[PDB]
Design a protein around this ligand. Structure first.
Ligand SMILES: [Cl-]
Ligand SMILES: [Cl-]
Length: 162
């Protein structure tokens, strides 16, 4: 199992504009298009992202191309962030994937907002960090996905995804 397969399980794949759990216009593998209510503002972002007139529909390849870009951006954003980088450097390969997942879903700013849990992860206090991560809007809004991510932090294995 790897970051790509893990995110593909959490986000799914959709070839037509859809609304995410928060109600925002999305497409592909969790690719956020816009927070605007306008389905047209969304089709516009979409064409701009793909470099063609899509009329809200893309192919598998296009979805995969956006997905590669997004994972790359997540990793690069972590490495460029003064609060995230030290955490990432401290972790093993599995737990590194769990942090990339959180960043992909909620952005760098969101994650950097989990100051206390991040400090616990750095100190390798696994059980304490899993408990603190659960006291969040994130866990309350997307409980099944949060549980999988949290178990990955607690155990350092891919168990929740197998
Ligand atoms: Cl883009
Ligand atoms: Cl969920």
């Amino acid at each position: 199992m790897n970051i790509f397969e893990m995110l593909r399980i959490d986000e799914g794949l959709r070839l037509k504009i859809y609304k995410d759990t928060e109600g925002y216009y999305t497409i592909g593998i969790g690719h956020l298009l816009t927070k605007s209510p306008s389905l047209n503002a969304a089709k516009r972002e979409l064409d701009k992202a793909i470099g063609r007139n899509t009329n809200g529909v893309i192919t598998k390849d296009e979805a995969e191309k956006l997905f590669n870009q997004d994972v790359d951006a997540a990793v690069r954003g972590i490495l460029r962030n003064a609060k995230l980088k030290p955490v990432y450097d401290s972790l093993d390969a599995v737990r590194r994937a769990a942090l990339i997942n959180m960043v992909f879903q909620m952005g760098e700013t969101g994650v950097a907002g989990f100051t206390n849990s991040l400090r616990m992860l750095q100190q390798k206090r696994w059980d304490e960090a899993a408990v603190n991560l659960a006291k969040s809007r994130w866990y309350n809004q997307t409980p099944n996905r949060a549980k999988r991510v949290i178990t990955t932090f607690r155990t350092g294995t891919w168990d929740a995804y197998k």
